[PDB]
Every structure is written in C-alpha cells, then in structure tokens.
Amino acid sequence: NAKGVCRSTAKYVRNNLETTAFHRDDHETDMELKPANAATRTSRGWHTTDLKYNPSRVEAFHRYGTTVNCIVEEVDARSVYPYDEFVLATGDFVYMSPFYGYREGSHTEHTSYAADRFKQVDGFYARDLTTKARATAPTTRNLLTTPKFTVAWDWVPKRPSVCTMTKWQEVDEMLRSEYGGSFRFSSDAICTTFTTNLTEYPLSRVDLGDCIGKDARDAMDRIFARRYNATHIKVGQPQYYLANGGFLIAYQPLLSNTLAELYVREHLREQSRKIEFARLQFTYNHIQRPVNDMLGRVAIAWCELCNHELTLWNEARKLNPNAIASVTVGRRVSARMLGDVMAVSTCVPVAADNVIVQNSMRISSRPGACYSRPLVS
Amino acid sequence: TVGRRVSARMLGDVMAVSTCVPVAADNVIVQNSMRISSRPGACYSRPLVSFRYEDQGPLVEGQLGENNELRLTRDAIEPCTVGHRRYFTFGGGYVYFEEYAYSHQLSRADITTVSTFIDLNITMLEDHEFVPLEVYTRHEIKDSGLLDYTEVQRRVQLHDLRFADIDTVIHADANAAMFAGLGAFFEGMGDLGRAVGKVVMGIVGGVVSAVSGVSSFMSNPFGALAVGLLVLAGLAAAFFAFRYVMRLQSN
Amino acid sequence: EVQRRVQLHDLRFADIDTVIHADANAAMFAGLGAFFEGMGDLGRAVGKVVMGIVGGVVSAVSGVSSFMSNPFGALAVGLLVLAGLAAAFFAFRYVMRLQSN
C-alpha cells in the first residue's frame, strides 16, 4: 500500500519443516509490481515477474536456484442470507461474515478462523498500483489470512431486513386437482407441477407486514380485469398453500359463465322440488364428471408438450452452451458444463474500432500448418 | 417416445431397442478415487462403482454413466488435468469430485434451477482464474469441462495434422536432401552439368543401395550372428598375432 | 461415444510425446543426482565433475551415431573393419607358418 513493492523473500514448507526462499538467490529487495497485460478493465491484477507471459519460462526454471513472485488481484465477492460466509471470483470460499469486525454489532457475527488471523484498520487510504495516486477519503479496512492467501475488503455495517419471500411468477391460468390425498397444480406457462397437502396455510400468522398478501391481491385483480371479467366469475376468497421444494402459492378459483348457469339451474330445481357457489362447486356429480374429463385432457396435452420441448432444448445445450445460456439470460454470457451441471459468468464488451485483423493465416515456422480462423490484435 | 427407460442403438438406417432393468439406490457404492495407479498419466472420466442386483447377491463392478445408468465396461478414460472439478448425478442428488478425488454429496435442492426458458434474475460475477503453477513449470494441461461441438471439431483437426506430419517423415528419406543438393549444383552447369551429373547420380545410387543391402541383412538374427562371429574371430586372431610378434620383438 | 473416442486418442498422443521428449540418459542422471544429493557436501564436490565426464561419454557416443547414420559414414567404417579383418587373418595365417616351422 505504501509504495507498490514486495520483499523478494518468502517462507515455504518442505520435508515437514519451514525454509526461506530468495529471488534468484539474492538478498531482500523491493520489487516493483507491474500490470498484467491480459487483465480486463475490471478484475485487475499485478505481478513482479514476467514469466507468466514471456516464453523464457522454458529455460528460466533451469537457470536459477529459486524464484519468488508476488501477486495482487482485484476480484468480485458474493454472500447470501444468513451472511455467514462468502465466495470469491476465483471459486474459493471464506468462512467469515463479510459484515464482521471489532465495531458495534459486527463482532457478534459468524467466524471460523482463529483470533490472530484477523485484523482491522481505521483511517486507511488506498493507492492505485497503475497510477501511483493516493485516495481522497479514508475507509475501514478488514484483513484476513487464509492458509493459501491473504484477503482484504472495505467494512460497512449490516444492511436492513427485507420481506421473506419474493414474487417469482404471475400465472394467468392454473388448473388444480385432487389426487392421492394431495393437491396438484399445473399450467402451460411453466413445466413444473406443484404438489401440496390439503390444509390451507395461515399466512396472517407470519406476514404481519402484508408484504406477500398485498402484492398477491393486486396481481390477481390486474389479471382478472385483463382477461376474465367478461367471461368468468370469482368463486370465493384467495387461498394459500406451501408446495414441495419451498414455494408459496396464492390461488383464486374461477367459474365460466357457461358452467355457472348449470349450478344455477340445479339449485333452482333443488329449490323447486322442496348464491354462494363455494357451497355447490363439488356437490353435483353429473356436472363434475364432464369437467374432470375436459380439464384432465387439457392437463395431459400440456404435459406431453413440455416433455417434447425440454428434450430438444437439453440436447442443444450440450452442443453450444454459450448460445443457449445467452438466450435464456438475455445478455452475452460464458458457460461451461462441469459434468451434470452448468457454470456461468459475464463477458466484457470491446468497441469495434479498437480491433485490428492480420493479413495472413499461414504459419511460417511449420510449412504444413495454417490457422483455422483469423488472427487479431 | 415409449414412456419408460429403454436402451437403443442405430443399426445403420433403422433403430434397435430393448428394456433396461432397475436397481435400488441403497445397493450401489461409489469409490473415492478416479486416478489409475498402473499408468500415471491417465484418469477415469466418470466415477467407479460397485453394486448388487438383489439385497443378498454377489458384487458387480462398473462405471457411473449419465442419468443414473450403470455401465459394466470401465472404459471411459482421459489424460489427467489440473484444476479438475465435477458434479455427477447420483440417486436423486449429486456427488462432488475435485482433483480426481471424492469430497461430499448434495441434494437436488441445494442448487438453483433455470426453471423457465427465459429468466433474468441471475446474479453472476466476472470470473478470474487462479491458475496452478504446474501449467508454466511442467507444461501440464488445464481443465476445461466437457467438450462442446466446436471443441470436438477443433481436436479432430489437430489429430489429422499430427498424422500428416508422421506421413511426411515415413514417405521421405535422408537421401532426398543429398540428391537435391547434387541436382541444384549440376543444373547450374548446363550441358557439362548434365554430362557429369548423369554418371555421378548413378554411382551415388550404387553406394546407397549397396549400404542398404548389407544393413538390411543384419535384421535377421542369423545375419546379425554371422557378422558378430566374424568380428569376434577377427579380434581373437588380431590379439593373438599381435602378442606373438611382441614375443619376436622381445627376443 | 464420439467424445469418448476423441479423449482416448489425445491420451495416446500424450504417451507418444512423453516417449520422444524424454531419453534413456534421464534415468542415469536421476540415479546419480539422488546419490550425490544424499552424499552431502562431498557429494556436490564430486557430482559437479562427474556430470562433466559422463556428459563427455554420452556426447561422444552421440557424435559417432550422427556420423554412422550417413551412407558414406557407414561405408567408411565398413571398409575400415573389412580391411582390418583381412589384415588380421592374413597376419594370423602368416605367424601360423612360422609357428609350424
């Protein structure tokens, strides 16, 4: 931080004992940190020795008795609730809360490293290794030593709380049926089938802030006004259910005008020989049988269609991961198959005038070979 | 198409089919390592397993295939890489391996799902590689996951280049450089160049063919033995006669 | 199956590369190196000169091997040994006459 240099010496372990290394077998010296040429605009990096890029590495390791190279790298970091640990853009984990420290409220957070491995600094000032210029305002700096690298970040107090659940999908049409002592839900919009117990969940016992309830009511009314107001009727008040896998479903049953009148004429005959549709919806067997057949056929049609599309899409995913992932996310991304799952990251853009193409694809050193695609700078 | 697990194979322009047999999840065991001990450069592509068809039956050996399939061959092998990481589907969950060794198991609920053809809520990072030093010092190959269609055709084009370089070496021979050197010298001398070159090329051809003949004879064990016995006899005769004349030289 | 075979072929090329990049003397140098490192200071004092003389031996053998591969090089030694055999057997038969009488 003070000058942009390292000591040219290090401690290492071999044969179960500690030993000291020295750059090219020479004495302790301040080595200058140089920018990495292939590093992006963001996620910058610096090194003390050029062997990572220069071809001299083919002989350098046989030319000197020992080498020492100092590395410094900027990376993105992410943490998720309950914020007990975090990950780095290199794929490594850190078993400590990003909000931890010695200040108020920070010292009670989760940690898995010894007390000597952590240190905090107040009134710290950053300095860019590229420009050699110092920062204008101070920060609080956290420092931690992992068994394979040291890591540092700027400290901030723990952010406020938020609603326990977030809206994922608004479904215009969703069929519900009862089978094997459980409810089953399905739609053409999503290929998932939700399964749930018959008992309704008491949402009011937990959503005291109405953050789930209010949003649900508004969405159901928007959908009803847009598509159903002219052809269907609301049967009763909304219902809440907790589906397998950790989803919460807000449901609103409907009846079409053409079907509602069948319940009306049955009720009129029942009243003649001797309205809350919620009391009648499943009582008249002769009306429900045609409905079970009609809607059962619709549900099966959607099920067969999902299997057809998933089968084609999952095969294309193996041939070209980048194209398939970019279409799903809606932006250019890089993707790779790590066995039976996919890993992803973001690509960085470059302006069209900052690119130059070379005139030849032939390799001069080996006459039989040629490049498949053009060379660029 | 059929609505159940089946095995299929393409016999040219038609398909052949048969039924698969199920095995219970508790009758299967996975091994801790993917490295091959007999040949240090090779590693298995997918984990090794052991299982039983019935709760009391003898053990059978295999390799874990795609989508819970149990293969009986143990033939998926690759050259070992650095920075290896993999997740394999296993009995309704996943098993995690790193640097060709086992680590732990996960539930299908532990990983986020791209549950729709389009979804924008993913919170990615700009990844930065923490490359191992062996890539520079020992020139070891860095892992790159499963091959895609572009990568497959890139490797096929690289292998046919290597075979082409081998063909050039066996089709050509060391005398071609000599013949080219001689020809380049003679063509520049005109009529005299051809008048001398035509006879010089003939005698040089006689030399290389004669040398090739005697060299070829030694390929046979009896040919190699005959020349070996001749030089051995010559050595015995030489040292005996040399020692004998040394006696005369002495007195 | 296609990607399984592609990975099997690149394993075979890696084994071929390993054989041509390495050489028979590496095993000898490794054996010598392990002995001299284990021998300590005196081991280094001897090893530094031993690698020089062994280098002279292997380079001399390679030097003649590079000559022997040429048709004229093979012919030159062939004519020399043939002449040596003729000289040896003639001289042996000659002294045998003297040995007889």
Residue numbers in the entry:
A (entry chain C): 202 to 475, 501 to 603
B (entry chain A): 554 to 804
C (entry chain B): 704 to 804
How did the manuscript describe this experimental structure?
The best conserved among them, glycoprotein B (gB), is essential as it performs membrane fusion by undergoing extensive rearrangements from a prefusion to postfusion conformation. Here we report a prefusion-specific nanobody against gB that is neutralizing with cross-species activity. We determined full-length high-resolution cryo electron microscopy (cryo-EM) structures of gB in its prefusion and postfusion conformation and describe the nanobody epitope and mode of neutralization.
By mutational stabilization we solved the herpes simplex virus 1 gB full-length prefusion structure, which allowed the bound epitope to be determined. To ensure the stability of the prefusion conformation of gB even without a membrane environment, all four stabilizing mutations were combined in one construct. During processing, no classes showing gB in postfusion conformation were observed, demonstrating that the mutations fully stabilize the protein. We resolved the prefusion structure of stabilized gB at an overall resolution of 2.74 Å whereas the nanobody-bound structure reached 3 Å. Notably, in both structures, the resolution of membrane-embedded domains is substantially lower than the ectodomain, which indicates an intrinsic flexibility of these regions even in the stabilized protein. The previously unresolved N-terminal region encompassing residues 90–106 forms a helix that is held in the groove between domain I (DI) and domain II (DII) of the preceding protomer that is formed by repositioning of a short loop region (amino acids 407–410) in the connection between β20 and αB33 in DII. By contrast, in prefusion HSV-1 gB, the three beta strands (β4, β5 and β11) are significantly (four to six residues) shorter. Fusion loop I therefore changes its length from four to 15 residues and ‘rolls up’, forming a short (2 turn 310) helix while keeping contact with the MPR by positioning W174, F175, Y179, F182 and M183 towards the hydrophobic cleft of the MPR. The region containing fusion loop II also diverges from the postfusion conformation starting with residue D251 and forming a 310 helix (S257–Y265) that is stacked on top of the helix formed by fusion loop I. F262 of fusion loop II is thereby nested in a hydrophobic pocket, created by residues I185, L252 and residues L686 and Y689 (DV) of the adjacent protomer. Alignment of our described fusion loop ‘rolled up’ form with the extended fusion loops of the postfusion conformation shows clashes of the latter with the MPR, in particular amino acids A261 and F262 of fusion loop II of the extended form.
